[PDB]
Ligand SMILES: O=C(O)c1ccnc(CNCc2ccco2)c1
């Protein structure tokens with residue numbers, strides 16, 4: 001079996017290998033990449049997402065979210081307070097202000113230490129889940145707005161035509177902005193491209209050990225667990241690497257830099273934080289290997305989790321027994 005220790009693998013495709021997205025994902029899996037839950041892909045040197053980032057300041061962040069923490073430094077929840085709209089130019093200026101800017105630090109490890117020591121004491125503002133794309137329409141390889149749709153994948157694999165669309169989202173970050181521990185909707189894959197700015201640090205649990213993370217989360221967030229059997233779907237829980245190590249949870253970490261892709265694999269729990277002002281683009285995708293994960297994915301039926309119209313069909317076709325209860329929640 002390839003990659004038995006479930007290490008995060010890093011790939012350097014050539015421009016020829018970068019031509020067929022599905023083929024390359026299958027190749028990575030042939031080398032065991034999926035066992036980690038996360039892989040890094042460094043694009044060929046000939047490739048670019050677009051010409052420049054000089055003309056992005058007039059994008060609107062209609063609902064910036066202030067991420068307010070509760071708990072202890074290594075075990076906390078965050079809630080999202082809605083703020084007034086602002087442009088990307090205004091947001092960048094805010095990110096770079098004395099109140100919000102990245103502190104002096106020696107290296108990535110020092111900044112990680114500062115994050116976990118100090119995150120709960122601040123409330124950074126995140127520009128999340130903004131429908132759109134920054135890929136040039138003439139970028140022909142790994143263009144996140146031009147991937148095969150999940151609906152077409154389900155149809156090719158299962159023979160059922162369904163409604164729904166699948167489009168990319170933009171994420172504008174600043175120092176300490178945080179993505180909580182989660183898997184993707186329906187335990188899909190994701191692909192994430194860091195277009196511009198400062199790095200993003202990721203934590204990931206191997207899919208084969210996801211239930212270990214779930215068990216710890218139930219113990220660490222007992223009221224949330226009583227409220228919902230799939231409360232990690234709420235995307236509010238943070239657990240530090242120190243706490244994970246104390247509890248024997250297998251995980252890995254890696255830092256993504258501008259110009260790099262990350263792929264998350266089905267049922268790979270992940271979390272992380274931004275180093276400073278940045279912009280990422282992400283989308284969910286599927287392969288034939290996803291279908292059996294989609295059938296088994298937990299669902300939030302308590303009303304809290306934010307679900308798109310497109311998830312209806314996935315639940316309806318893959319999880320007909322659950323559909324009734326899940327719809328009552330949505
Ligand atoms: O803030 C982030 O950089 C971030 C990191 C990881 N996971 C996510 C959310 N899931 C991916 C996805 C698929 C479509 C849109 O997002 C966000």
Ligand code: NI
Nearest residue numbers: 183184190264
């Ligand atoms: Ni994600």
Ligand SMILES: [Zn+2]
Nearest residue numbers: 228300302304
């Ligand atoms: Zn719930």
